[PDB]
Amino acid sequence: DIVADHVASYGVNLYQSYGPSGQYTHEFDGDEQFYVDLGRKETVWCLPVLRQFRFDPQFALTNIAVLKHNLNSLIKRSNSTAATNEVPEVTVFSKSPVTLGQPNILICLVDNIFPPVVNITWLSNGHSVTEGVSETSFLSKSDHSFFKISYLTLLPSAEESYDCKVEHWGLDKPLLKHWEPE
Amino acid sequence: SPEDFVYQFKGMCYFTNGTERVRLVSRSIYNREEIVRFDSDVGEFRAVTLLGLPAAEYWNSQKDILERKRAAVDRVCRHNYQLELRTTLQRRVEPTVTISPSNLLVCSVTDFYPAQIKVRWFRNDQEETAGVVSTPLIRNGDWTFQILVMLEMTPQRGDVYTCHVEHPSLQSPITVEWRA
């Protein structure tokens, strides 16, 4: 709601009871600069140029600890008021215009995610696809829900289609977004 | 379905005209509800709902806590910005422009950064405006964008359609032609 040329999150600090699990990331103008691998105490940069800089992963763990405490205080103080399940909003598109046999990337955009718990997987002609698959962290929105993007690498070929398969608590039955080359 | 409790803390920096105006707003969120906030414009914590009241009262009572949050806009925001100026704000990735049929002509402008971009259609050296409609700017998630700019036409003999694209990354504008 604040108007600026550039907007950073030099700390999107997340903790949740379910799991439990955490996440720590820096965002700049809507993109993920890095996340910290909490289980490994490791900084993973997401924009190559930024590998020249340092950021001590330890302190991200510390931050999550603070959050963990505070969450406990607020669960107590709010009479155990638990999160509301939203319905996620799915879209699948390609990175490049489609050329048969020429390398592409499928993007699965999953929006309005809350709570930050979701399973995002791919389906080729009914079978599932394991390799060529990666995804972003949970990215923040100003309304405090998240979005997350899943990627699949492929050579487009006629009569060869894909489904992006999303599972969320706000969803009665898992959702499938289809993609044909055409 | 399972139950879940979520706590978020966001240390957000807002920059305008380079580094002339810089604003910090630390935000605490309990399940999508911001409850306490430190905004460098204000200068102290403010509950934003009742849940955030004890927190703000306690934190504000600490002279050394406020001392350090007031310095944060310089310690965290202005500092990082210098690093951003040398890298992130220097990222220039050039658009790749492609014309193709859907009676519609789609001009695909893909894989660019930063977001500022101007795409114009021409028909035989004349600009077309009334018959053009863009998709919204699409964010790829990989530090690039893309956008699709469609044009309604009915092709006549000897017609040349031109997609014209302006981007900070280009010294000279890209033009791609298409023929009936």
Binding site: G11, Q52, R54, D56, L67 | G11, N80
Partner: peptide
């Protein structure tokens, strides 16, 4: 001499 990305730090409630 390697430059560092800094972060805002959260506070403990009482």
């Amino acid at each position: 001499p390697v430059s560092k990305m800094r972060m805002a730090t959260p506070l403990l409630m009482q």
